Design a protein around this ligand. Structure first.
Ligand SMILES: Nc1nc2c(ncn2[C@@H]2O[C@H](COP(=O)(O)OP(=O)(O)O)[C@@H](O)[C@H]2O)c(=O)[nH]1
Ligand SMILES: NC(=O)c1c(F)ccc(OCc2cccc(C(F)(F)F)c2)c1F
Ligand SMILES: [K+]
Length: 307
């Protein structure tokens, strides 16, 4: 009975905002850690564990949009970061790229987690085009440093939020759509670990698909009625918010959850939808859960890696 320890680590302002809004959902088995230079913002974190990094460097302020200060701050506090990560089997490092603390400290946090043997997944945003070319270039250097430091990376370009709002959608409601990329991935792994499937997948399968595998997609689709399996699988692989599409995926961990009505035929239909985008040589690990509490709903979940 292996019970994998998951930790979610927010780094910098945007990363800790996302963690705060996830905590408001009361996610149970996951440990949340807040890392920031900015002591004012950190004091408002809802996370159980708070690490103020770089206090001697920034005097308790943020990094002032300087990634070099964010990096140095994380290095100054390496021992406190190590202490906080201790015991993790999987770490999600979440951060907004383009500022000073996330850009510079998130790759250091990720490297420390990977050095300690944890499966390390980064979930980061790129800045809106309206924030300027300079911020975008700073963020892209952060993205590349994150790629070098993580097992798998999910990139959310903030510009994609402009594809799902109308002219009146509140900014905070838009931000919750981006938060949900992180939330569904964390929750989905948590479910995989906790629940015993009829075709059972576990953390070792997650490790095979995600360890040292570059870009990643973590998606979920829910549908009912006619064509529910095709529609749910299409939703799981078709988020408007991701940079990396599933085209070309070399690894897929896929699960279908339904009630007792879940048919073998619709399992095939869902798998074929996902296969018809991945590489012909994709390593597919397919699982199934029968949840008799469900009636007509089917849930398809996909991890796709390897581009
Ligand atoms: N989607 C989203 N993006 C954010 C949020 N906060 C900040 N950002 C983005 O993250 C980038 C860096 O900002 P921030 O995390 O505050 O900087 P840092 O604290 O110095 O690392 C910004 O340029 C924005 O693109 C948020 O709550 N949601
Ligand atoms: N068959 C199982 O043991 C099982 C189970 F009993 C519960 C959930 C499972 O998969 C959840 C999942 C899969 C891929 C991607 C995601 C995420 F949403 F994170 F992207 C989540 C399972 F495989
Ligand atoms: K399982």
């Amino acid at each position: 009975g292996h019970m994998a320890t998951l930790k979610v680590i927010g780094v910098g302002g945007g990363g800790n905002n996302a963690v705060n809004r996830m905590i408001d959902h009361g996610m149970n088995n996951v440990e949340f850690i807040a890392i920031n230079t900015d002591g004012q913002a950190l004091n408002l974190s809802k996370a159980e564990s708070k690490i103020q990094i770089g206090e001697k460097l920034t005097r308790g302020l943020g990094a002032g949009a300087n990634p070099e200060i964010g990096k140095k701050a994380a290095e100054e506090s390496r021992e406190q970061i190590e202490d906080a990560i201790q015991g993790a089997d999987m770490v999600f490092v979440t951060s907004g790229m383009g500022g000073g603390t996330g850009t510079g400290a998130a790759p250091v946090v990720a490297k420390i987690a990977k050095e300690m043997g944890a499966l390390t997944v980064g979930v980061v945003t790129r800045p809106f085009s309206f924030e300027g070319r300079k911020r975008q270039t700073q963020a892209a250097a952060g993205v590349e440093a994150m790629k070098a430091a993580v097992d798998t990376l999910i990139v959310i370009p903030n510009d994609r939020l402009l594809d799902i709002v109308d002219k009146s959608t509140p900014m905070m409601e838009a931000f919750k759509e981006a938060d949900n990329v992180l939330r569904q991935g964390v929750q989905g792994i948590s479910d995989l670990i906790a629940v015993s499937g009829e075709v059972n997948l576990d953390f070792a399968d997650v490790k095979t698909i995600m360890s040292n595998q570059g870009s990643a997609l973590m998606g979920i689709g829910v549908s009912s009625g006619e064509n529910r399996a095709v529609e749910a699988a299409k939703k799981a692989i078709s988020s408007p918010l991701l940079e990396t599409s599933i085209v070309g995926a070399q690894g897929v961990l896929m699960n279908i959850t339904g009630g007792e009505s879940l048919s073998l035929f619709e399992a095939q239909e869902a798998a074929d939808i996902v296969q018809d985008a991945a590489d012909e040589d994709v390593n597919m690990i397919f699982g199934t859960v029968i949840n008799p509490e469900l009636q007509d709903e089917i849930v398809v979940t996909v991890i796709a890696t390897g581009f």
